[PDB]
Amino acid sequence: GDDELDQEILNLSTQELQTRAKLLDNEIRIFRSELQRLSHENNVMLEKIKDNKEKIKNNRQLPYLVANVVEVMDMNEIEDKENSESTTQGGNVNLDNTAVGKAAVVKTSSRQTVFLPMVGLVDPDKLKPNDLVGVNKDSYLILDTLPSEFDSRVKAMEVDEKPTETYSDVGGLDKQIEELVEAIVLPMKRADKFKDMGIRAPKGALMYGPP
């Protein structure tokens, strides 16, 4: 940050610090060449990334298949000195080459259960059980991710509390109205106490009898 401190001025006088200035230039020119070395290695590499991404583009865009993940298997990676799979094959150690690392079991909508070599741009990290996933239509590989399924009836089912019947418009019905509060309403509101004490919460309830 701080150049030519108090200390360097006493030590070495101004004339000397001229000879110092010249030596510095010579070494700055050396380092300056390395920047041209490094720039280049960076320039070629960018070109490579975009050349790949162009080949991907065609496969990747819609249309493709919809599937579900049954489970992420998480098959082994590396236990041999060649490939990434237990079996010994011609290839060599990579995520994909002829080597297969992780894999996952999907249940297609084409009514098949496919165990597939895993892609580079979809990892097992990016999954969980029971996730909806785009799988390429023609060859079965996890191609891209999708959020979880949503359905029109499912969305509707949440919220319908109004019409409300309360307990002032339902004539009598006790013991049972009291019992319902104890099971449900009373632990719902004082929820913090119920954690602290260590007692269980009722594990649902069944209300039954003639209609």
Binding site: Q61, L62, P63, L65, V66, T108, S109, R111, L146, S152
Partner: peptide, 29 residues
């Protein structure tokens, strides 16, 4: 918009665009 459709084959697909379709005509249901 991508649109997720279910066929009468009961296989499911994300399906491309049309040639005069509007995003304001094709919706759930």
């Amino acid at each position: 918009a991508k649109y997720v459709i279910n066929l009468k084959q009961i296989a499911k697909f994300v399906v491309g665009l049309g040639e005069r379709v509007s995003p304001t005509d094709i919706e759930e249901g």
